[PDB]
Design a protein around this ligand. Structure first.
Ligand SMILES: [Cl-]
Length: 210
C-alpha cells in the first residue's frame, strides 16, 4: 500500500561545454536549439540531434524538442556517459562539461512555460506532463539509479527530461558543478568577465561524473 511521491524541491541539471558559458552570460540565457543559440561547441549525439528536430511535444506550448532547453533530473546522466565513452562526435570528454543546476519549482515560480517527460523525449512511448504534481508519475528509482545497465528501460527512464520553452534565463542557475578544480578556476575567470551576470556557486563534484 503506497502513494507515488517526488523529491521537493526537484533539482534539474543541464550539461554544456565550458566554451558555451561566455555566450550564455552575454545573452543572459540559454537559447533552445531552434532559436539560433550563440553555441560555441556541440557535445550533441548526432542521432539524438536529428531526432530532436522531429520529436513532437503533445503538451502546450507544443512544437518539437529542439524548441526547448532540456534538463535532466539527475547528474551523471546517460548523455554524460555518451560523452565520457567518446560515443558523441565531440571527443573532448567530460572534464570541460559543466552541470548547470536549477529546480523545477523555480521555473514554475518564474512563470516560464515548461513540459516534462517520464523518459527520453525522442522515444515514441514518452509520456509528457506540464503540472508539478505529475512529477509523481516519473520513475524516481530509475532517475536516481547508479546501476542502470539492465533492464533496458532503466537507461530510457533515467533520461526523463524537464524542457523549458524557447529560453532558460541564466539567473535561475543556482550552481555550476565542475569535474575539477582547474575547470572551476576557468569558470570563475569567465564569470568575472561578465560582472553584471548572476554569479552562482561554483562546486567541484567529481562524483557527478564517470
Ligand atoms: Cl529529451
Amino acid at each position: 500500500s503506497m502513494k507515488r511521491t517526488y523529491p521537493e524541491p526537484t533539482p534539474i541539471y543541464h550539461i554544456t561545454h565550458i566554451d558555451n558559458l561566455k555566450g550564455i552570460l552575454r545573452m543572459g540565457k540559454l537559447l533552445a536549439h531552434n532559436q539560433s543559440p550563440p553555441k560555441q561547441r556541440s557535445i550533441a549525439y548526432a542521432h539524438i540531434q536529428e531526432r530532436r528536430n522531429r520529436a513532437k511535444v503533445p503538451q502546450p506550448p507544443g512544437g518539437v524538442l529542439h524548441d526547448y532547453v532540456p534538463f535532466y533530473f539527475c547528474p551523471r546522466s546517460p548523455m554524460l556517459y555518451a560523452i565520457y565513452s567518446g560515443a558523441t562526435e565531440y571527443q573532448g570528454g567530460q572534464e570541460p562539461i559543466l552541470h548547470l543546476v536549477s529546480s523545477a519549482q523555480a521555473v514554475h515560480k518564474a512563470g516560464l512555460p515548461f513540459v516534462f517527460t517520464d523518459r527520453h523525449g525522442v522515444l515514441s512511448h514518452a509520456r509528457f506532463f506540464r503540472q508539478l504534481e505529475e512529477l509523481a508519475q516519473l520513475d524516481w528509482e530509475a532517475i536516481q539509479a547508479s546501476y542502470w545497465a539492465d533492464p533496458p528501460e532503466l537507461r530510457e527512464k533515467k533520461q526523463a527530461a524537464f524542457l523549458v520553452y524557447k529560453a532558460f534565463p541564466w539567473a535561475l542557475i543556482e550552481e555550476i558543478a565542475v569535474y575539477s578544480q582547474r575547470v572551476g578556476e576557468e569558470v570563475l575567470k569567465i564569470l568575472k568577465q561578465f560582472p553584471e551576470a548572476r554569479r552562482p556557486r561554483v562546486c567541484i563534484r567529481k562524483d557527478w561524473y564517470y
